[PDB]
Design a protein around this ligand. Sequence first.
Ligand SMILES: *[C@@H]1O[C@H](CO)[C@@H](O[C@@H]2O[C@H](CO)[C@@H](O[C@@H]3O[C@H](CO)[C@@H](O)[C@H](O)[C@@H]3O)[C@H](O)[C@H]2NC(C)=O)[C@H](O)[C@H]1NC(C)=O
Ligand SMILES: *[C@@H]1[C@H](O)[C@@H](O)[C@H](O)[C@@H](Cn2cc(CCCOC[C@]34C[C@H]5C[C@H](C[C@H](C5)C3)C4)nn2)[C@H]1O
Ligand SMILES: *[C@@H]1[C@H](O)[C@@H](O)[C@H](O)[C@@H](Cn2cc(CCCOC[C@]34C[C@H]5C[C@H](C[C@H](C5)C3)C4)nn2)[C@H]1O
Ligand SMILES: *[C@@H]1O[C@H](CO)[C@@H](O[C@@H]2O[C@H](CO)[C@@H](O)[C@H](O)[C@H]2NC(C)=O)[C@H](O)[C@H]1NC(C)=O
Ligand SMILES: *[C@@H]1O[C@H](CO)[C@@H](O)[C@H](O)[C@H]1NC(C)=O
Lengths: 497, 495
Amino acid sequence: ARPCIPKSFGYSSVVCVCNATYCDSFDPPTFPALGTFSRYESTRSGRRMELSMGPIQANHTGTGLLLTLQPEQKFQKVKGFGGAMTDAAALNILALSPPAQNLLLKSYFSEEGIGYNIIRVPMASCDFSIRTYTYADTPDDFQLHNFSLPEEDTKLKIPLIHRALQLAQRPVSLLASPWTSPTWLKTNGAVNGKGSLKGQPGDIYHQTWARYFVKFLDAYAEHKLQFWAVTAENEPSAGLLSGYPFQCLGFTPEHQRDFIARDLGPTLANSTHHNVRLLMLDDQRLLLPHWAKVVLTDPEAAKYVHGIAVHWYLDFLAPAKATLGETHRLFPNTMLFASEACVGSKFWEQSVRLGSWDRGMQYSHSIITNLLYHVVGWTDWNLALNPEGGPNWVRNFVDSPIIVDITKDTFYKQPMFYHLGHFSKFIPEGSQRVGLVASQKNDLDAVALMHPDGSAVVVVLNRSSKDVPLTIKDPAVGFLETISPGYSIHTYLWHRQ
Amino acid sequence: ARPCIPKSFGYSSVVCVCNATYCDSFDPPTFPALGTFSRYESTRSGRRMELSMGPIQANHTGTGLLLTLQPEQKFQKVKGFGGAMTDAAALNILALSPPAQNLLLKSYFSEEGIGYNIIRVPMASCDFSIRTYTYADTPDDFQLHNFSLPEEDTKLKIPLIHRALQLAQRPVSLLASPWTSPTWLKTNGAVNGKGSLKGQPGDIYHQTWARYFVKFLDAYAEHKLQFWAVTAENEPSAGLLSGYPFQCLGFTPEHQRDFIARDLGPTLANSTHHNVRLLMLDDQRLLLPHWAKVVLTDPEAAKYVHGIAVHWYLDFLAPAKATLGETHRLFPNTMLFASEACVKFWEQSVRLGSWDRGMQYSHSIITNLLYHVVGWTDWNLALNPEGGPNWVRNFVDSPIIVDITKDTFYKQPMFYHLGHFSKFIPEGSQRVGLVASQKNDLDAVALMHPDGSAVVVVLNRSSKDVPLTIKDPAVGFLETISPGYSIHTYLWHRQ
Ligand SMILES: *[C@@H]1O[C@H](CO)[C@@H](O[C@@H]2O[C@H](CO)[C@@H](O[C@@H]3O[C@H](CO)[C@@H](O)[C@H](O)[C@@H]3O)[C@H](O)[C@H]2NC(C)=O)[C@H](O)[C@H]1NC(C)=O
Ligand SMILES: *[C@@H]1[C@H](O)[C@@H](O)[C@H](O)[C@@H](Cn2cc(CCCOC[C@]34C[C@H]5C[C@H](C[C@H](C5)C3)C4)nn2)[C@H]1O
Ligand SMILES: *[C@@H]1[C@H](O)[C@@H](O)[C@H](O)[C@@H](Cn2cc(CCCOC[C@]34C[C@H]5C[C@H](C[C@H](C5)C3)C4)nn2)[C@H]1O
Ligand SMILES: *[C@@H]1O[C@H](CO)[C@@H](O[C@@H]2O[C@H](CO)[C@@H](O)[C@H](O)[C@H]2NC(C)=O)[C@H](O)[C@H]1NC(C)=O
Ligand SMILES: *[C@@H]1O[C@H](CO)[C@@H](O)[C@H](O)[C@H]1NC(C)=O
């Protein structure tokens, strides 16, 4: 293990500096006897996933907040955590020297980093691209004889995905999402703006667009990459807005329902990629539960939909209970997944703030809220950006957990990276959220899960300036006496037998 | 009397051009004879509140969309419509030649314009100011011996308000809202950023701040202006945010509750201005219903609160039933009032002739009216073509854009979308039920005037023409069409 090398850029906390020869990392995981817990701590004051151990004791010395594990109250199983291999992320990572590239990829994908097991892959260009392109830009090619992957896939994204999977011990799930179709399939003839597929579900335009998904999966399969899932479209609501500035393709909930039932579902099912899952929506949670009611009440669409993908960016427009909670209640057998788990940079702030503790707290706060409202997994957006929050061909109000400074062969791990890691490292695929009861009203955010092997994990976030004395009770083991310091995040792990 | 002079700026529709000698206006209001209906139309294609009259048919057949009036299903009574006399609005208006000033004020405030009966007045400086003054900038002036109105009030706002009221036949209600206190009353000692009043409700800071509201009302009353209402603070949630870029003053809902109960409520009640009403919140409706529960479950605060003031940002959509609807349900005797609205860092701050931005206005007013809201107040009455001035460059759009170099002003689609409501819904109008016979792409709302006559506004946000009928059981069937990208106001006598 190597500790964080801290650097301040004048914001509330520090980044951890990595270069060709040095990056902070963990020892292989190693968990103690019954009656002992492990704690990992990160603080605004500068501690970065520091390990300590202590006792779980028969006697309860604490008189403050008590959180009681309720392992018999069982909720969702976790699919996992990761981020997006955009053109921008791949260009940033590949501009480091190879030893630094390897340390950046280990930070995310190795058991000695934070154990990512999901990668989201754009299908061709988006805002985080240095140019507009699709896989089939030659028009009137309805059989897609001229479908092909450019250098962005074959030179940048695919090689980095192979390297990410080689570093990971955990199986990695790939998720694909398209932003735009070829412009000759669109009503507006442009990559952006208000525009849908020409014609109507069932017709040659809709069949061609469905076939493009299969051509995409074939091309990645020729490069020894298989997908867990695809989404029906990235932010389908964007393509219904006049002047939408970057790559989009508009679907009303009804058009998504009919495109899935008539074209995309049957096309995937008749292909060699019939095991690939399909997620719907891939858009703001305020569109729930309406979008889920329109698509999932039609059995011919429902039979092809494995899950509902939600984006965080505009979460402030509607609370979790009315959107995620109501959707689960109405469709309890369709998983919820956060496919774009990134937060907006307030208009009076720069897109990248090196060392922002606040932006880290926004990530851990949203993951806890999601977990308390049935969500099974998270993909962050860009795995890495440059210090301007690019490259991007339009203009964006977003940060990234890793910021690459090409000119110094160095990369900076943001507080966001450690806030993600407090979940991603310690919540493997198949972990199950369980009860955790607060004894009294409190200012903490907390969640409990049980690993597949039955061991406990609890994450405690303190977004307040005040230290909160805390007891955690495991009925099977006893009492964990601890403190949640102001502006801290803790992950607690223990054996239950 | 005078039609729109259209001008394209290359966007989806036209502005109407006004100058020192010409502005579009209406004839004095008329009412259609019993058995007939009036229709005012505005279209993306360029019609601007064009008047036509049709017959009310005793019979109707067909499977086409029917909207049926439920005159016995009675909802909220309307307070009115208007906008804000900011420093920026007044500076722009007073840079026109006097005759052009007069035609701008008539456009909004005359019976021959769109009949505004609300003006929102900032208490000292906001982002739509060219500097950052309060009325009491002498440090630690707890007795407010150096309280005074600067030229922004005495030379720009007050004279324009007097002129607006002189033009208006309808009584006008003035609404006052502060953005910041003096810096010496604030924890952070700055007009902007994260900061709340120093100390605790009941203390010298909180009593001085409450006495500042009385000094404001005293000074406006010396200038023969009286207020209908004040808000407890503009966007109190803003001053809880670190780096908040312009004038703000942070309150939690608990802090607002306690400031009203201990200081602002009693101070106003013991003053010569006790008839002035107090609105709480004055902020974005996502804070509802929690903010209303915190303040209004405390009877010591509730007894001082007349209403809940809401804001929205029209490029976004928010739930209305869960915020406005649930608030009305908990607190049905406390009116909801929309005190600020406006309109994509990619599009300019001002898009001269944007039909889209017009439809965002009328959609928002219909949404609000369908969820108990009694009034709807635009932001700046007028801005320059850059969307200014604004000392932090927080430029936005306005229904009237002043071109000082040309002694010209442009009435945007927003002005006409607003007018379709403000001109035809007098104070005291009551919203009534209006049931659709089938799912449809139309926004519609029905109200009855104090005198019993009917008004229906219909907006078509789709590109498709929609045939429809309006049924009023007292008179019969109004056969009509909503063209795609149109807004219509219908008027008829019921007896
Ligand atoms: C203020 O705006 C008004 C209205 O747009 C301007 O009045 C208009 O002046 C134009 C001059 O360009 C007139 O156009 C010409 O009219 C003559 C006489 O009928 C005709 O022979 C020409 O073919 C041409 O159309 C227009 O009639 C007139 N409209 C009205 C109602 O007066 C006015 O010039 C503007 N004032 C300033 C200072 O710019
Ligand atoms: C998710 C998306 O799929 C990614 O492509 C994108 O990079 C990412 C982060 N993001 C968004 C932005 C700027 C905001 C884009 O406009 C949003 C919008 C859309 C309409 C409604 C509302 C007001 C305006 C019109 C602007 C919000 N920068 N980075 C995610 O969006
Ligand atoms: C009202 C305010 O009192 C005026 O001083 C100001 O000039 C005016 C214009 N305006 C708009 C904005 C911010 C636009 C985006 O903010 C984010 C947002 C958007 C909605 C959802 C959520 C809560 C709010 C509504 C704010 C996040 N700044 N000034 C008005 O603000
Ligand atoms: C990569 O970062 C590491 C750690 O910050 C740097 O290693 C330090 O190098 C200096 C020599 O200038 C030593 O005195 C320190 O003891 C080193 N620290 C450790 C822990 O090894 C290294 O300099 C960096 N590389 C570059 C090119 O700057
Ligand atoms: C404050 O008022 C006093 C007394 O009336 C006056 O002499 C002084 O000029 C004022 N201060 C400012 C800054 O205007």
